[PDB]
Coordinates of C-alpha atoms in Angstrom, one line a residue:
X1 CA 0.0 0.0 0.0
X2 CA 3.2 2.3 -0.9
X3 CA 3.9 3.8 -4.1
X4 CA 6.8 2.2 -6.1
X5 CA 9.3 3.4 -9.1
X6 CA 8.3 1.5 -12.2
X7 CA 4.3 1.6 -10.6
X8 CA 1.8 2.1 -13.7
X9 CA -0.2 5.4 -12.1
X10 CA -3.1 7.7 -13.1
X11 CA -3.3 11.3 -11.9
X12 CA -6.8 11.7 -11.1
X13 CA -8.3 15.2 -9.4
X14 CA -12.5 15.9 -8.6
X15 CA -14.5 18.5 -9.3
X16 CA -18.3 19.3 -8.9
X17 CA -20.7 20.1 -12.0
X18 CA -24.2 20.1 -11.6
X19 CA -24.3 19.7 -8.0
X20 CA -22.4 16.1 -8.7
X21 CA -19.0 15.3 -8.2
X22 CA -17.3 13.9 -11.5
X23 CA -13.4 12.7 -10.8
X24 CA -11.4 13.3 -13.8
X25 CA -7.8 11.7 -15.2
X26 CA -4.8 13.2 -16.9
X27 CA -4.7 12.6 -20.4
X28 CA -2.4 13.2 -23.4
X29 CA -1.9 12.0 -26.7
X30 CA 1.6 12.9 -27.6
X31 CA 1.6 12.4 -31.4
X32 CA -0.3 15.5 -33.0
X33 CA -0.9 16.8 -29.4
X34 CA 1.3 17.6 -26.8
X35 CA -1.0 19.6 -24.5
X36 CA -2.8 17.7 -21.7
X37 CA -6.2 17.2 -21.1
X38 CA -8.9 15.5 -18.5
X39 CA -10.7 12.3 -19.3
X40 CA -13.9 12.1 -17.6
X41 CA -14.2 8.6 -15.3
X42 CA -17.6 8.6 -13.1
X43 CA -19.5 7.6 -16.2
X44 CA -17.7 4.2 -16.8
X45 CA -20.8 2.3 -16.3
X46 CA -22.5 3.9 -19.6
X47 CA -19.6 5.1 -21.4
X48 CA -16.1 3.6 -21.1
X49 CA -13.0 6.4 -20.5
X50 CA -9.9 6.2 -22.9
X51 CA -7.6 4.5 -20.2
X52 CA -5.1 3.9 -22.7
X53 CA -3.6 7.6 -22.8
X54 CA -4.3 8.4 -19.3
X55 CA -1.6 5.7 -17.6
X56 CA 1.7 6.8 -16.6
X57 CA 5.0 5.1 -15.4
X58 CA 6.8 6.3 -12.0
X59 CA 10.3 6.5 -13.3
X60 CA 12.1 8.0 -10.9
X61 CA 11.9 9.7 -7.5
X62 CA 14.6 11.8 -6.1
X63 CA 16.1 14.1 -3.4
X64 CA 16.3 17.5 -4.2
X65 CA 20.2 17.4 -3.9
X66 CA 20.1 14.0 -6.1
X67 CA 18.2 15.7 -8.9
X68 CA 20.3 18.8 -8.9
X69 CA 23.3 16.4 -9.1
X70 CA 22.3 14.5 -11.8
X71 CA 21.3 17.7 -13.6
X72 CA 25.0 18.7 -12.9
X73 CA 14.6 -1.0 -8.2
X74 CA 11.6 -0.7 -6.8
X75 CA 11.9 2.4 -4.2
X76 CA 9.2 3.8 -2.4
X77 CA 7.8 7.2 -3.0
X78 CA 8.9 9.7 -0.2
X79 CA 7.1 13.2 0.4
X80 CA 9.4 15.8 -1.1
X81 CA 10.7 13.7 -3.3
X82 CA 10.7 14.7 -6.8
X83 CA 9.6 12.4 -9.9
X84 CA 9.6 11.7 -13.5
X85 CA 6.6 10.5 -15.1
X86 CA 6.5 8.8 -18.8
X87 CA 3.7 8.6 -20.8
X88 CA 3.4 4.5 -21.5
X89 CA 1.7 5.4 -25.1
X90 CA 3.7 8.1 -26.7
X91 CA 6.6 7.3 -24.8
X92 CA 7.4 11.0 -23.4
X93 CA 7.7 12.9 -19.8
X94 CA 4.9 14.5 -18.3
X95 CA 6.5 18.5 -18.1
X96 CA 5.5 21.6 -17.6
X97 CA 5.6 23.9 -21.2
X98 CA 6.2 28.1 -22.1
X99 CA 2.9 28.5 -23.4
X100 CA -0.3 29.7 -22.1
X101 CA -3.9 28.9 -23.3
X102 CA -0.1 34.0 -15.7
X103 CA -0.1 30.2 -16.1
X104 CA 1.9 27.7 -18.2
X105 CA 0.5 25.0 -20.0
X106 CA 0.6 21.1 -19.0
X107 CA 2.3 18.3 -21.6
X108 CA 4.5 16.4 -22.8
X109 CA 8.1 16.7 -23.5
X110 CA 10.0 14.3 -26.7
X111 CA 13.3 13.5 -23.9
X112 CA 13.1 14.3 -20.3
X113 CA 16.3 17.2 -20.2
X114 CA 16.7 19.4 -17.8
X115 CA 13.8 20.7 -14.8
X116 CA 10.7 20.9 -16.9
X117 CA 9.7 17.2 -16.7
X118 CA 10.5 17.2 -13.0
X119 CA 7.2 17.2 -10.5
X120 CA 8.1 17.5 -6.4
X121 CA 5.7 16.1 -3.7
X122 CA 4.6 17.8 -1.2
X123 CA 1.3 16.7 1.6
X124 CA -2.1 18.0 1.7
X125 CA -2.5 17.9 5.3
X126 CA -1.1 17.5 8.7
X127 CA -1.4 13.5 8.2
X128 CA 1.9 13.4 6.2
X129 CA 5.2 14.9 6.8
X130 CA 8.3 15.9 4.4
X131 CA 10.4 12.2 4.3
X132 CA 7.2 10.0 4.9
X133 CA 6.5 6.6 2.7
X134 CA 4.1 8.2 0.2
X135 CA 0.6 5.9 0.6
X136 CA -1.8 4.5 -2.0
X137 CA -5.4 7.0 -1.3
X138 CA -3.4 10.1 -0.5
X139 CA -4.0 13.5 -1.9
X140 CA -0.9 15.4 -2.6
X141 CA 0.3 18.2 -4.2
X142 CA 2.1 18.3 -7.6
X143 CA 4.8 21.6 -7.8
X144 CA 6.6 22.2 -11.7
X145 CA 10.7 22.3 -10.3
X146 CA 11.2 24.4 -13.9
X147 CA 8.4 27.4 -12.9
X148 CA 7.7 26.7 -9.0
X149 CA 3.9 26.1 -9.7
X150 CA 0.8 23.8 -9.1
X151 CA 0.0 21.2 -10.9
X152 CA -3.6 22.7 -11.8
X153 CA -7.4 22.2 -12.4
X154 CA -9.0 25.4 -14.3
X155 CA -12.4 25.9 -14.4
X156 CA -12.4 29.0 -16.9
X157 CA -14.2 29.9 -19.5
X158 CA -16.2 26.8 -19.6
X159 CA -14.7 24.2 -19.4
X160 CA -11.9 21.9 -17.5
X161 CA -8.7 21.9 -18.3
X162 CA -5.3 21.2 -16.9
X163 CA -2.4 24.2 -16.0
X164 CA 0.6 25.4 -13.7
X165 CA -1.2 28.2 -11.9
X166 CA -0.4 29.6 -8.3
X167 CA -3.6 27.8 -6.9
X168 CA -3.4 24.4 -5.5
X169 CA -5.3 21.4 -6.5
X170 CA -5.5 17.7 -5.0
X171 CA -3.8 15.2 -7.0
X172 CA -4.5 11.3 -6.2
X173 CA -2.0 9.1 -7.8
X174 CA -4.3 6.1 -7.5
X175 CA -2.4 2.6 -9.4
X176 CA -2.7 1.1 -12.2
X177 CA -0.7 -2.0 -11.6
X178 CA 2.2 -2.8 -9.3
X179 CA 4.9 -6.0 -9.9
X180 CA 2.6 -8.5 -11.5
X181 CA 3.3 -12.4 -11.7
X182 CA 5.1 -12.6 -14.7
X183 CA 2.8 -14.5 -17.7
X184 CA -0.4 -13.8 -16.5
X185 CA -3.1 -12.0 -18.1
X186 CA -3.4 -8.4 -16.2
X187 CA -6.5 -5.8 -17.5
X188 CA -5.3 -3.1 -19.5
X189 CA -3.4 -5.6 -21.8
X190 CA -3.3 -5.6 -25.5
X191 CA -3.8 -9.0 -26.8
X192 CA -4.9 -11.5 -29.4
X193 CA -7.5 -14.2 -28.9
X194 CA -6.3 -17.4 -30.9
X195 CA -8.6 -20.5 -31.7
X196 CA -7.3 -23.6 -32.4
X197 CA -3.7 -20.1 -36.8
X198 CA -7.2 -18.6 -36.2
X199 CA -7.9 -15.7 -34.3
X200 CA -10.5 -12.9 -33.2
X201 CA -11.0 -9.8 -35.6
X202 CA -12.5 -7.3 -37.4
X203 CA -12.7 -7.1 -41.6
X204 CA -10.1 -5.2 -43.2
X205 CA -10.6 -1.2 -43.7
X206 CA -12.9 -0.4 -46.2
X207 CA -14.8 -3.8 -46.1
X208 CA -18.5 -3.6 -46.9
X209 CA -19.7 -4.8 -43.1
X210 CA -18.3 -1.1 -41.7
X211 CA -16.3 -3.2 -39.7
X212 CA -19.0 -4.1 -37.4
X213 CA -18.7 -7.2 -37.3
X214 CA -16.4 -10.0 -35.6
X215 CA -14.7 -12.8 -37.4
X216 CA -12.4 -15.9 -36.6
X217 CA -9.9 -15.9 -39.4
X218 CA -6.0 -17.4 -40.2
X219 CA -3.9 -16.5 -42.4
X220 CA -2.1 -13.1 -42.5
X221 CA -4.1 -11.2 -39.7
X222 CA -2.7 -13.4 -36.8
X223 CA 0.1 -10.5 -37.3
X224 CA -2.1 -7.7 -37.9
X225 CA -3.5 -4.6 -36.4
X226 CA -7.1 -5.7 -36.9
X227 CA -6.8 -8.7 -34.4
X228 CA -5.5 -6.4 -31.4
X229 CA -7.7 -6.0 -28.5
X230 CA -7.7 -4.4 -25.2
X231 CA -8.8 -6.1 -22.1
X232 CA -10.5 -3.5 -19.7
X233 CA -12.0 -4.7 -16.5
X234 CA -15.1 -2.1 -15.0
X235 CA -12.6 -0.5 -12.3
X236 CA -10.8 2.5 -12.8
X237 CA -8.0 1.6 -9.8
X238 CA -6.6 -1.8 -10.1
X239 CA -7.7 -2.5 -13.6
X240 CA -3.8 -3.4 -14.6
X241 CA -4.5 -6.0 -11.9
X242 CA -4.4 -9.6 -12.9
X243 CA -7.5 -11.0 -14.6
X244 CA -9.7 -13.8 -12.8
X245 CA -12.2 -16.6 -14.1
X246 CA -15.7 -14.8 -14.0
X247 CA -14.5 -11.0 -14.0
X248 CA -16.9 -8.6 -16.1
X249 CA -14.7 -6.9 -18.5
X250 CA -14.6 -4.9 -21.4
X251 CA -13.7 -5.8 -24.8
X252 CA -12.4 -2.8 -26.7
X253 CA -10.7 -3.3 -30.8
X254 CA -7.2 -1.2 -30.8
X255 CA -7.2 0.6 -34.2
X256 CA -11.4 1.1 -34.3
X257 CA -11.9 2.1 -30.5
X258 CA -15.1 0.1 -30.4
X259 CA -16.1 -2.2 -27.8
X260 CA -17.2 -5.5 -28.5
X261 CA -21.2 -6.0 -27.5
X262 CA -24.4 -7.8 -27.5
X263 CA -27.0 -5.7 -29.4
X264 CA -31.3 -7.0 -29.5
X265 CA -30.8 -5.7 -33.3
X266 CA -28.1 -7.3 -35.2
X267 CA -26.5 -9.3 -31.8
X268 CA -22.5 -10.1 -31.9
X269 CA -21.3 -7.0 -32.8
X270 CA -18.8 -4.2 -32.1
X271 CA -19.9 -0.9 -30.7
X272 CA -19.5 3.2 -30.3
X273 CA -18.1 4.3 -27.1
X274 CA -20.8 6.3 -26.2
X275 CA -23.4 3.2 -26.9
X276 CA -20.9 0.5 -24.9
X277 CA -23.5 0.6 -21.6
X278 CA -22.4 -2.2 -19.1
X279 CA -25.4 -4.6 -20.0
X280 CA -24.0 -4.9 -23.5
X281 CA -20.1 -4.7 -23.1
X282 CA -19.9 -6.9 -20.4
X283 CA -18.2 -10.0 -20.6
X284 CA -16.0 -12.8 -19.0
X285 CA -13.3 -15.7 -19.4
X286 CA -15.1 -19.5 -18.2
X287 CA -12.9 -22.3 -17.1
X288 CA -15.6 -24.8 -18.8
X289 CA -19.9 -23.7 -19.4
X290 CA -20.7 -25.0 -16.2
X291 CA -24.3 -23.5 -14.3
X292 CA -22.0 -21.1 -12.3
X293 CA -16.5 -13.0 -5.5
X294 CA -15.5 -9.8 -3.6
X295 CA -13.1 -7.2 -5.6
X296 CA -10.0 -6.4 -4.0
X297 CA -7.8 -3.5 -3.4
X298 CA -4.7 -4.8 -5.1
X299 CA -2.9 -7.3 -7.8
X300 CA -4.7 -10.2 -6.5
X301 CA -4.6 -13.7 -7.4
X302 CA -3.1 -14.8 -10.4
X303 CA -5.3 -17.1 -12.3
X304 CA -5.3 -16.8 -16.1
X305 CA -2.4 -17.2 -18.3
X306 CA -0.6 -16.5 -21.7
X307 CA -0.8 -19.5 -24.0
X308 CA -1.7 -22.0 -21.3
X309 CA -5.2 -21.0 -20.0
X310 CA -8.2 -22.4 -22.6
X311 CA -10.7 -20.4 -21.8
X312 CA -15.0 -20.0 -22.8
X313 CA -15.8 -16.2 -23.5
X314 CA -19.4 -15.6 -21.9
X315 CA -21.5 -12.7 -22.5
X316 CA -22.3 -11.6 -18.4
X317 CA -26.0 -10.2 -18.9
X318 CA -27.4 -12.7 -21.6
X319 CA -25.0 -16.0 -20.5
X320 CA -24.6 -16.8 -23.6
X321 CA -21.4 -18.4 -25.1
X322 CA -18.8 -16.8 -28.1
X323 CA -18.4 -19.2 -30.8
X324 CA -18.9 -19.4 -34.6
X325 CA -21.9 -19.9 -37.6
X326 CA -11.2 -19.6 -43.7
X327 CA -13.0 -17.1 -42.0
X328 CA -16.1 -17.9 -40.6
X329 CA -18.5 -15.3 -38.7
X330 CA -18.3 -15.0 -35.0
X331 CA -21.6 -15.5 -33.0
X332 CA -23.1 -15.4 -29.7
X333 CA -25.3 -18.5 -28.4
X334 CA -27.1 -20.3 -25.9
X335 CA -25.6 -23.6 -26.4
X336 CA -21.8 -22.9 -28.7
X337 CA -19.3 -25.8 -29.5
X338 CA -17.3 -27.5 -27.9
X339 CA -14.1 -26.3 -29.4
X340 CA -15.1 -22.9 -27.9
X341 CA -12.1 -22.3 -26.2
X342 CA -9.4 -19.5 -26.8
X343 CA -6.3 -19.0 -25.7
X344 CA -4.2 -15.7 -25.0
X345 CA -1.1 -14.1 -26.7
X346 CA 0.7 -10.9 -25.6
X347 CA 1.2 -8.6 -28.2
X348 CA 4.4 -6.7 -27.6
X349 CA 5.3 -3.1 -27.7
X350 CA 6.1 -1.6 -31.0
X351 CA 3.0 -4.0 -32.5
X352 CA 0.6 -2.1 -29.9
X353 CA 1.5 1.1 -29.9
X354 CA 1.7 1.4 -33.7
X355 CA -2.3 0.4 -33.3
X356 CA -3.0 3.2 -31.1
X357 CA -1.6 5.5 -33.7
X358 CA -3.2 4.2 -36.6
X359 CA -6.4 5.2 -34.5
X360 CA -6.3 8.5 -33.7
X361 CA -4.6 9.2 -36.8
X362 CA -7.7 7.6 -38.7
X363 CA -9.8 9.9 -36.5
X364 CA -7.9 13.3 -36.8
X365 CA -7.7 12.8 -40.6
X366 CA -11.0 11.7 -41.0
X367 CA -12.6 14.7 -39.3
X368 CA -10.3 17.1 -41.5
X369 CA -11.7 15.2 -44.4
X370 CA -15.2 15.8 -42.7
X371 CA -14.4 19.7 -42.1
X372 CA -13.4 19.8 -46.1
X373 CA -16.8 18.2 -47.6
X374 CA -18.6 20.7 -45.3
X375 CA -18.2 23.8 -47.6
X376 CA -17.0 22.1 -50.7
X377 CA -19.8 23.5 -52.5
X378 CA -20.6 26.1 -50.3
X379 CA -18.5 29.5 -51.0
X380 CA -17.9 32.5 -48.3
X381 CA -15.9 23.7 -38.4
X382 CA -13.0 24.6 -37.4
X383 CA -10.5 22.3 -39.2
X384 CA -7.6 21.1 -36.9
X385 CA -5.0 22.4 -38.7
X386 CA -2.7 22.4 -36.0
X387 CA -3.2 18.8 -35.2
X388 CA -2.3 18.1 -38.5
X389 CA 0.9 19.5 -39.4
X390 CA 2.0 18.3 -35.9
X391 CA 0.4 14.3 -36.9
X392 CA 1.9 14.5 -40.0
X393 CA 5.4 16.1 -38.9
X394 CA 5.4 13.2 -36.2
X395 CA 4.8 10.4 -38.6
X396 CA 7.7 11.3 -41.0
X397 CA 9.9 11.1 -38.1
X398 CA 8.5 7.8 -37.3
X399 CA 9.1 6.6 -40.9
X400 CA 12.0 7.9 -41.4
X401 CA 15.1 5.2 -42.3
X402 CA 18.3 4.6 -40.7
X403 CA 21.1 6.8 -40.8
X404 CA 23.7 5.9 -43.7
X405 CA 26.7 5.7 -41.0
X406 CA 24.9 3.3 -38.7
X407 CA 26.3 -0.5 -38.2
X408 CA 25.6 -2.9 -40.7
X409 CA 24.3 -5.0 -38.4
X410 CA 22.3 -2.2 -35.9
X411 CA 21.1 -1.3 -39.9
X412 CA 19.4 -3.9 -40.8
X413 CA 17.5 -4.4 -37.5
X414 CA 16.6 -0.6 -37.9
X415 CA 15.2 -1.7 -41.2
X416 CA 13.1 -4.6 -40.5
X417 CA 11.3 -2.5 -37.5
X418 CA 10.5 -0.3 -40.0
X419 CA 9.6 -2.4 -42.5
X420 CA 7.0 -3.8 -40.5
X421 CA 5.8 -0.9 -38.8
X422 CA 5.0 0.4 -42.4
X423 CA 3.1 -2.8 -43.3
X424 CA 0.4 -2.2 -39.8
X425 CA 0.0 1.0 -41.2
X426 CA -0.6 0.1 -44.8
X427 CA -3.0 -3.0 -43.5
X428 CA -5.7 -0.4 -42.2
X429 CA -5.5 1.5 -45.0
X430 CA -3.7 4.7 -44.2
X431 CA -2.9 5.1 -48.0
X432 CA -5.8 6.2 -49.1
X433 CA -6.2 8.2 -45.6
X434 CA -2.8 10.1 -46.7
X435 CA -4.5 10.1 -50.2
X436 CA -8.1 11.3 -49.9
X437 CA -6.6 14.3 -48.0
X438 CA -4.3 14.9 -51.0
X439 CA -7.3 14.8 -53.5
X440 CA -9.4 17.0 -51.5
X441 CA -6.9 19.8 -51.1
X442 CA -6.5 19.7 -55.0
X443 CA -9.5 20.5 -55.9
X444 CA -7.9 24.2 -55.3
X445 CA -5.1 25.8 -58.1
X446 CA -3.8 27.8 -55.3
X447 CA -3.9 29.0 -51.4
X448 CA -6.1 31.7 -52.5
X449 CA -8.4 29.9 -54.2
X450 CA -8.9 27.6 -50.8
X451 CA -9.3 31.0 -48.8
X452 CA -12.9 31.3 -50.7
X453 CA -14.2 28.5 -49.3
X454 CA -11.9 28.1 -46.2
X455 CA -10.5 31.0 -43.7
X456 CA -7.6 33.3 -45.2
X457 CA -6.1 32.1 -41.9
X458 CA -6.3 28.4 -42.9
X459 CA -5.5 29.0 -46.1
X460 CA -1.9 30.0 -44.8
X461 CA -1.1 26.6 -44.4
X462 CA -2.4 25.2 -47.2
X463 CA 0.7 24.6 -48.8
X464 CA 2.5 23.7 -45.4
X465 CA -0.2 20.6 -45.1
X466 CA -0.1 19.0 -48.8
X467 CA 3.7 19.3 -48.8
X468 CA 3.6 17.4 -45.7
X469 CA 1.0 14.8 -47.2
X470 CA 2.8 14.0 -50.0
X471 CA 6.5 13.7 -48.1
X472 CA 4.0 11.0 -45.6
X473 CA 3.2 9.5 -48.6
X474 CA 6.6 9.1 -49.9
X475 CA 7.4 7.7 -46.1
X476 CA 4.7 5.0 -46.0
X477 CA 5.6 3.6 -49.6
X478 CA 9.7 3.7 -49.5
X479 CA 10.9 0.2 -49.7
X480 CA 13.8 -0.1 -47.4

């Protein structure tokens, strides 16, 4: 009941709106945005949060003479202490920025240098004292070591949002996960479900089912983006805690961000966020279809396992059982098969984050494809111009090839990662993404001629953005 270094942590905060306390988490995208913002938790029951980009890793905590002498395993969190906190997603350190939306602005920083991604603890009462074991429940206050200032909820206009202002807000660092047993199946895992080689998905991008719809199928996807899924248990603390036989749980698809449900219309399906209500979302891993306890503040017992653990997929409400009607449609019913059960592969790193950033890059483009159809016929939605160039910027980087004076060896390694990282992103078709946004800016000879149906201010980037399309493009298609 101490906080750890190399502890998977949220930075939750509460506030009241419409006479109701709603508790809120820190969340940041990285890629495309490096600002911070607050996803919303209380509502979990009818709409599920984005976890994903809210977890953060405790990667060091220091004294105040230790961190200005390195600017010159497991150890437990001490008030005063001052830490480092990377984003598990995008990779980068939770700092305080120059900007202002007389108070910074809260993000994220590409390599943790020098005191702007530093954050010192301090207590929010009496209760603890300057050198005390920091505990799990506390509230504590966050202080920049770069500007000297809060870590802080805004209210203004309209709104919340996150800042470094002079007034104080409570922090709780509530866990994720601590040291789990190592091979067994924790929430908040990215996976894929295997049967029998066969495995759970989605169609391919474009398919005429509007990806709605759930298949077991070999071949080629077994190393794909479409067969990735997310394991979310209904718990906002401890849901990186291992996973046990008859847990309700969420079922949420990686590049789509749509949760696998039970719908009285068209039945096995997969759903919108903001239509994944409990009843239909829920589901849990059987040891057999038999007729068929008390949730705990911690890891817990470890009872499922990669690769070893068959296990029956029930639907929690209904009772019924996953199964199937190569690539065969996936159903859910009364009775199933008796070859029903899956088994559990870990997907690692590079494979899972590349998912998440074929997501909300489908999402940001598509809604600047969205913006554009708005007043293509109609002459004079904000479009997130912004975002863009930043997305776009971003993903050359992550393209980009090795450097020419690299090791052969270190070379070809560099290549292969690429290589494949190139082939997830081509998969769910992020060609014709980068393409239909090249089209659709074309339709205009010049900048000007976009500033009649667009701003004169958007229309100063016009140029900026389809240079930057075409250099993606270039990116996604090299060889290497």
């Amino acid at each position: 009941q101490f906080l750890r270094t190399d502890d998977e942590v949220v930075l939750q905060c509460s506030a009241t709106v419409l006479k109701e306390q709603l508790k809120l988490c820190l969340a940041a995208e990285g890629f495309g945005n490096r600002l911070c913002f607050l996803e919303p938790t209380s509502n979990a029951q009818n709409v599920p949060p984005d976890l994903a980009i809210c977890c953060f890793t405790l990667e060091q905590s220091l004294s105040v003479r230790a961190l200005q002498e390195m600017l010159a395993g497991h150890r437990t969190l001490l008030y005063g202490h001052a830490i480092l906190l990377r984003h598990a997603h995008s990779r980068m350190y939770l700092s305080c920025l120059t900007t202002s939306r007389l108070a910074f602005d809260v993000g994220l920083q590409e390599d943790a240098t020098g005191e702007a991604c530093w954050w010192t603890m301090h207590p929010a009462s009496k209760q603890r004292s300057e050198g005390e074991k920091v505990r799990v429940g506390d509230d504590l206050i966050l202080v920049s070591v770069s500007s000297e200032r809060y870590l802080h909820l805004s209210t203004a206009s309209g709104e919340l949002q996150v800042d470094a202002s002079f007034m104080q807000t409570l922090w709780n660092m509530n866990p994720i996960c601590s040291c789990c047993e190592e091979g067994y199946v924790t929430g908040g895992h990215i996976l894929r479900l295997f049967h029998g080689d066969e495995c759970l998905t989605i169609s391919a991008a474009d398919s005429d089912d509007q990806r709605r719809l759930v298949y077991y199928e070999g071949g080629a996807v077994c190393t794909h983006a479409r067969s990735l899924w997310r394991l979310e248990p209904l718990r906002i603390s401890w849901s990186g805690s291992h996973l046990r036989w008859g847990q309700p749980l969420r079922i949420r698809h990686v590049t789509t961000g749509r949760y696998l449900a039970l719908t009285e219309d068209q039945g096995l399906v997969v759903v919108d966020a903001c239509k994944a209500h409990t009843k239909a979302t829920s589901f849990c891993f059987r040891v057999s279809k038999e007729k068929l306890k008390r949730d705990v503040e911690g890891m817990g017992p470890p009872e499922i396992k990669y690769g070893e653990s068959l296990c029956f997929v029930q639907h929690v409400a209904s009772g019924l059982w996953l199964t199937y009607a190569l690539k065969k449609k996936a159903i859910l019913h009364q009775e199933g098969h008796m070859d029903d059960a899956l088994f559990l592969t870990r997907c690692q790193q590079e494979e899972s984050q590349a998912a998440r950033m074929i997501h909300s890059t489908a999402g940001l483009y598509n809604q600047f494809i969205k913006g554009l159809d708005s007043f293509s016929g109609k002459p004079r939605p904000a479009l997130p111009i912004e975002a863009v160039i930043l997305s776009l910027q971003d993903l050359i980087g992550y393209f980009e090839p090795p450097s020419e004076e690299l090791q052969h060896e270190e070379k070809q390694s560099k290549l292969r990662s690429l290589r494949n990282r190139q082939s997830l992103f081509q998969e769910e078709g992020m060609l014709s993404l980068v393409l239909n946004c090249i089209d659709r800016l074309n339709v205009y000879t010049t900048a000007a001629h976009f500033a009649e149906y667009a701003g004169e201010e958007a229309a100063e980037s016009w140029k900026e953005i389809v240079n930057l399309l075409y250099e993606l493009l270039a990116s996604l298609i090299r060889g290497n």
